[PDB]
């Protein structure tokens, strides 16, 4: 993986209409991967999640983020530690935030390794303007790799 | 009376799949969405804003289809989306200054 840097000219002609984003680091990033599901509701082992996890950690370091990592966490552990992450004091001096969540899931929630669910609204809420004042006005990016259902998209023929 | 804020704003959220549907993953290469995400971001963060990059990831996912011979998932599809309460362009400006 290699990240092409932007040119000074590009920065000069684009910074005025964009979010302030020049802090070093650009932000804290958190990559949270569940792969092995050791729980009640049987959820298939996420083969290939190892490559997902490695790719993002690499990607976000190269985009200039300070990357934090959590693996194979229960619903409750994900919730507590997401809250700990949202409350970290570094967010005041950074210009943005990244949270990537990789797991099995259902519409609007994701699974911990215990087969229990964390609601995605609760997650976004941890970073909102009331709960995470230090990220007020700052762009917060979330990437959710998780199913939102069980039915296969069979696909449709192109007329 | 200063300017105040909504309770939630300035967020962008990328989903590997659409409401009620499954996201696909290759057991050797990893997820379709993450792979696509890495390719676009690494290539275009330098001159494209995140929302636009995610439209670019949409295009890659729309053209992909499953390889799972003998199974019900052979040729299956997936579609990614993103939802945005962003209020400005989001350029990541990699490697500047």
């Amino acid at each position: 993986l290699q990240v092409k840097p932007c040119t000074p000219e590009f920065y000069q002609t684009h910074f005025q209409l964009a979010y302030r984003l020049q802090s070093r680091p650009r932000g804290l990033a958190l990559v949270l991967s569940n792969v092995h599901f050791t729980g009640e509701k049987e959820l298939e082992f996420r083969s290939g999640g190892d490559v997902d996890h490695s790719t993002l950690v690499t990607l976000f370091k190269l985009l200039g983020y300070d990357v934090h990592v959590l693996c194979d966490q229960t619903a409750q552990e994900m919730q507590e530690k997401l809250q700990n992450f949202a409350q970290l004091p570094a967010h005041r001096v950074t210009d943005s935030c990244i949270v990537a969540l990789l797991s099995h899931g259902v519409e609007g929630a994701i699974y911990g390794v215990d087969g229990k669910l964390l609601q995605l609204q609760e997650v976004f809420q941890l970073f909102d303007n009331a709960n995470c004042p230090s990220l007020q006005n700052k762009p917060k990016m979330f990437f959710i790799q998780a199913c939102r259902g069980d039915e296969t998209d069979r696909g449709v023929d192109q007329q | 009376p200063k300017m105040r804020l909504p309770t939630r704003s300035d967020m962008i959220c990328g989903y590997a799949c659409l409401k009620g549907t499954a996201a696909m993953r290759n057991t050797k290469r990893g997820s379709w969405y993450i792979e696509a995400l890495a390719q676009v971001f690494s290539e275009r963060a330098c001159d494209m804003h995140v929302a636009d990059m995610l439209v670019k990831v949409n295009a890659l996912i729309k053209d992909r289809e499953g390889y799972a011979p003998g199974t019900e998932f052979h040729r299956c599809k997936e579609m990614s989306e993103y939802c945005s309460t962003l209020c400005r362009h989001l350029y990541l400006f990699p490697g500047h200054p």
Partner: peptide, 5 residues
């Protein structure tokens, strides 16, 4: 091979 997430 491709599997559901």
């Amino acid at each position: 091979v491709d599997v559901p997430x």
